[PDB]
């Protein structure tokens, strides 16, 4: 089959988060995030690593962004730090912080990347937790619109492209179910409650960005694991239907219709969880279409049956030790499997590249919308070789191959704006700290110290480089 | 905990005109394209055809004070277009429309709501003379002129409509597979004549929502939702796209107005897609159902299929299992037997959960209530003396079908009926009368009419018990 090219002004793209990368944590008025606040709990992050200093981009977006105009790179996706905007979440602005970003955003143009403005990567500020709980409280809606209506104010003008919630699924279910990121919480009657809440707020602020960013583009971006069904059995297929809707469509149909799907709503009923409905809560969420959906995908998950006294939490891959996590599930509706005919990672994760083409031509199938990749990227422990070399061959080789894919679902039909790769330089993650590392720039420190955090370009650096020169004609 | 069947649940059960009336030349009706079709040399098993049927145009008084003693909430049954226009778009004839009045009159006076299907497949022949039929423009207007005259007449007594009746089944078996009229094996104009009937479909909704403006209207599809035969991400895309062409093709049409994207980029850089007219998209997409109709039978497996691989395959045309073949579009997917599922001696899947996915899907894809308006299980029956017929293998078809039904509404789908397949037996389209499917049997075979005496089946009173309790004695 002849392949479609990527478009000509395709968003070859790298991204990263801020509370993972600036630093500068208390610097400049800003405020305290949930973040700053929860990495400090002894035990809550590996060996204590926390965002005071990350990998200091605060301090060095300059010379990051000269890296990304030697790479080429079309576009750079972050996210900005609402506690550098409003410390307290609502009242004072803080200018100084807001000059951050307007630094940022000049040095991005003048060097022609675009940028595109994440709203929001899971900060929300400490004192808006401490004043209502944050997501569990309507305020938040009026207070994250203010926020996000005063960067569309100063940026508006020199950025087209705007994800507002990031990962919603993720911030939700492991603030308020596992308990694991802020606020801690293990009760998923709150968490469907929050949930419900945060939905408004993306319908809000895409109702705000019509009036102030005319002709902007703005989504929501979803982490999505497209599902799987174990074989042809039809309980496992139902299974499929089950996990599709309960962990994907409960987020895209809200994100592209405004609706929840009917079966998973019935089901929380069965079980007492469904969100509280306001009057007027339909009629926000139905007005608030986007312009694209945003993907962050890394893989699919395979499903088979599981009854009612089933499979519930299983045990997560935190180490990278091949071969150690176990099944997760919902009973009564599916419960997960290894997939026999793909590779993992050595955290047990599928490489899957064609199950990205699968989940772009589902979108594309039940909204019809285009497609922004906001995030796409293997983690893995690199090694510094001498001379400041890093060979990262598997890193070449798993973005090839989901490049690859991607062209193929272009070939299909689907409109893809652009990927973004995580990430741009190595950064800290939100437990496990420096080691899993996921740049196309390493950065030189580690678990124990700041070192001198210089950045070397790994060998898929110019890999990339290479891809976006042939605007990938050349994988 | 399972929910009850709501209690407005319309049990019921079905027929289609050709299939059931006989009278094929009688009080001026015109010919059908299956009165000609059925007359060709070895077309249909022992020349077997709908000149007499089972009578029910005769006997239609009978066959109704059979449906009051079961008790049937609803019947399905399909108005015979050349009854009421004999050459399609000519003058109406009145002994043909007071047919179907005496017959909703009859329904009624027993308190069984009529469900009128305007289109089983028998456009009349006149038409395909003229222009060829669903190949041409011109029927978009004609079948528009029929359904409102139908509209007219009934629509102050029947609340339930169905447009096209297995618009995929008519247009692939008469322009694909050439197995049905007009004996067409050409995937282009299978196409032109799809995309001219799912027009004439979306204008006759308009115009109800003109002139039965409290009726309830919908397309019924013969779904046979699609599994993919593992987690092999090629086996998984493989599915994507047969649950695409299959499925969404016709359905993603009735709901929304849109060709899936994917499928239609392949059919045009094939030279396949339909030609497209200035107005059409606005037509198609104006016109949403209130429900979506679904004739189920069976899901369907499929795999990768290589470029070289298979393209159209054989299909089971005597019984004998095994003899189909698989099918699909190469380098997209092909069928394999499902491993996990029963097969009957067609070749056709035995399984009731299918029915839960199918309705599932439905309802998360497009959010419409769904009327089930075809299921059943058609097998030979023995005659005992004293005119007994126990077919237990019926009601236990029947009876897992409608428990996976109640697990559908259970997790949310808006079931408004079921309508079993048939009331009584009937013609077969190719393949005689051996095969029943009907709680009524009727004594006649393919060489004979015999008396055509009805004879109700055990099934027929396991029935009469569902509808008597609403579904809580299965």
Same mark, same amino acid.
């Given at each position: ?15 990263? /988060? /801020? ?39 605060? =301090?060095?977006?300059? &010379? ?10 079309? /576009?750079?996706? @972050? ?12 009242? /004072? ?22 940028? #595109?403005? $994440? ?25 994250? +619109?203010?926020?996000?209506? $005063? ?5 508006? +003008? ?6 507002? *919630? ?27 409650? %929050?949930? =419900? #809440? ?38 496992? !297929?139902?299974?499929?239907?089950? %996990?599709?809707?309960?962990?994907? =469509? ?23 969880? &469904? ?5 007027? +809560?339909?009629?926000? *969420? ?5 312009? @694209? ?42 419960? $997960?499997?290894?997939?026999? =005919?793909? +590779? ?6 599928? #490489? ?37 070399? !890093? ?32 990430? @741009? ?35 898929? @650096? ?14």
């Amino acid at each position: 089959r002849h392949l479609k090219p990527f478009p000509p002004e395709f968003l070859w793209g790298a991204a990263s /988060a /801020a509370y993972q990368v600036e630093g500068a944590w208390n610097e400049d008025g800003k405020g305290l995030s949930v973040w700053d606040v929860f990495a400090k709990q002894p035990g809550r992050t590996f060996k204590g690593t926390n965002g005071d200093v990350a990998v200091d981009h605060y =301090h060095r977006y300059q &010379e990051d962004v000269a890296l990304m105009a030697e790479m080429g790179l079309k /576009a750079y996706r @972050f996210s900005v730090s609402w506690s550098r905007v409003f410390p307290d979440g609502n009242g /004072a602005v803080n200018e100084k912080g807001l000059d951050f970003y307007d630094r940022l955003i000049e040095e991005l143009r003048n060097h022609g990347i675009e940028p #595109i403005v $994440t709203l929001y990567h899971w900060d929300v500020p400490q004192a808006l937790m401490d004043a209502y709980g944050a997501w569990e409280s309507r305020r938040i809606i009026d207070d994250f +619109d203010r926020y996000a209506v $005063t960067l569309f104010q100063r940026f508006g +003008d020199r950025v087209k492209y705007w994800v507002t *919630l990031n990962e919603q699924n993720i911030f939700i279910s492991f603030g308020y179910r596992l308990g694991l990121h802020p606020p801690g919480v293990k009760d998923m009657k709150r968490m469907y409650e %929050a949930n =419900h #809440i945060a939905n408004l707020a993306n319908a809000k602020v895409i109702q705000s960005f019509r009036h102030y960013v005319p002709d902007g583009k703005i989504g929501p971006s979803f982490a999505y694991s497209p599902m799987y069904p174990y074989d042809s059995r039809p309980e496992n !297929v139902l299974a499929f239907e089950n %996990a599709e809707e309960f962990q994907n =469509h409960w987020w895209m149909d809200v994100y592209a219709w405004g609706m929840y799907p009917q079966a998973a709503w019935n089901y929380l009923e069965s079980q007492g969880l &469904e969100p509280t409905v306001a009057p007027g +809560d339909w009629e926000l *969420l139905q007005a608030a279409k986007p312009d @694209f959906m945003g993907v962050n995908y890394y893989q699919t998950t395979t499903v088979e049956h599981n009854p009612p006294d089933g499979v519930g939490e299983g045990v997560m891959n935190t180490t990278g030790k091949k071969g150690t996590s176990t099944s997760s599930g919902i009973p009564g509706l599916f419960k $997960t499997v290894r997939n026999p =005919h793909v +590779d993992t990672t050595n955290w047990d994760w599928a #490489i899957d590249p064609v199950g990205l083409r699968i989940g772009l031509r589902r979108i594309a199938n039940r909204y019809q919308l285009p497609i922004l990749i906001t995030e796409n990227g293997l983690g893995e422990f690199d090694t510094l070789e001498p001379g400041d070399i !890093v060979n990262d061959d598997y890193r070449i080789d798993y973005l090839r191959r989901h490049v690859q894919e991607i062209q193929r679902a272009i070939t299909d039909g689907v409109d893809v704006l652009g990927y973004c790769a995580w990430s @741009f330089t190595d950064l800290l993650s939100w437990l496990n700290g420096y080691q899993k590392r996921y740049g196309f720039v390493y950065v030189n420190r580690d678990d124990e110290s700041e070192k001198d955090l210089r950045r070397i370009k790994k060998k898929s @650096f110019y890999w990339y480089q290479r891809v976006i020169e042939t605007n990938g004609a050349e994988l």
